[PDB]
Amino acid sequence: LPSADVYRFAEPDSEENIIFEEGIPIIKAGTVIKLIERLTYHMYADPNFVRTFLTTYRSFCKPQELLSLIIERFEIPEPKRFRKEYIQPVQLRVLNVCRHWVEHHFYDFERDAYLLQRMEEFIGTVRGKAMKKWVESITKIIQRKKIITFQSSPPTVEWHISRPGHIETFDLLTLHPIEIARQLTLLESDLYRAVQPSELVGSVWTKEDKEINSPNLLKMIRHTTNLTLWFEKCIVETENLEERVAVVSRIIEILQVFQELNNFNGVLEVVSAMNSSPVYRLDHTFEQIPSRQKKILEEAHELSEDHYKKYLAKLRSINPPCVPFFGIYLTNILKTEEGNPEVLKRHGKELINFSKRRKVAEITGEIQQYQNQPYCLRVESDIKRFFENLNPMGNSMEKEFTDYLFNKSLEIEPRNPKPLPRFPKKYSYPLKSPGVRPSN
């Protein structure tokens, strides 16, 4: 026997309130006042419903109004022993929800100082010395946030033509291919691990304030784009056909090392550089490519076909660490959010569709899964700093630079009827690849 509902959201579960998905019930839609009711249910505690709600709630509720209605949930009026038994765990759930909130989603409070003020006021209001001794934990979490050994030692850093410290002489054919793939895998794994779910939920990276709300995601995407462009620029600006096949071969070797290190982001970097307009038509250059590397590149390219069928397969099969490809996740998230209704309607009443939010949360979780295990590879500071300050475009813009690349391709390999002119050599050092199998 709870209150009269004129002092609570105690209205019993109805079809105008909640609908579940055909041993805890999976909520599929419901009025917000009952959504939080199930979030702080007395019958049972649902930790995954908490983890999913607090990650995907801003799309139908602002942090302030959530704090307000959870405070409204914590303040229960009495109509006895039965009812105190009921009141205890509801308040417990509310306080553990606040704990999870400040723990895993503290940004909501860094962007709203008054939200933190309300939270601190609210936790300073709980009474019952036992409960308050338990509340000190949330207090300490707030105060905190306001202020790996592998089996064998990682393999040696490999060098080729550039001796360590000679950063001036760093380039694609100067550094060892294996180490190029390694340092790129490290940088891209760090970029992939830095992306937090607050930058994907709500499709916020596609809206006008994407620079503000998705800085790490855009940083990683720009890195991969920049490297694809650098690959094309190395191929096409190498006007001598001999050196140009050298460049293409080293790039295919780096693709091999990517395939091995399970760095699929870098694999796609390379195969995009190959599928570009300026590079895809260099018939006279791919002619001289060994067949064993042609099959490597073909196996890589087949990963994206039929909507990345083989990529999804291989990613689900391999053992991490790995740098998966992000674009697929982003496409799926955007299409779920903009392809499913924001609310369901029943008996003329609007209920927040939560299933959609749960699916987006699943995609977020699969992103976070691969962010755990790091790479057992030693970083070289200066090679990393070489690939961090690479600017193929320079001061040019997208169209200007794309056209420069395509026109350079036309220059080094004119269309059929015209004969292939030969160019002088660019690189005054040997072009033999030092293999792609390590030293020892």
């Binding site: 190959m274 895809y280 260099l282 018939d283 250059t285 791919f286 002619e287 490519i289 067949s291 042609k294 099959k295 590149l297 073909e298 390219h301």
Partner: peptide, 7 residues
């Protein structure tokens, strides 16, 4: 298709 032919 593709310059990376195969046979």
């Amino acid at each position: 298709x593709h310059p990376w032919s195969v046979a």
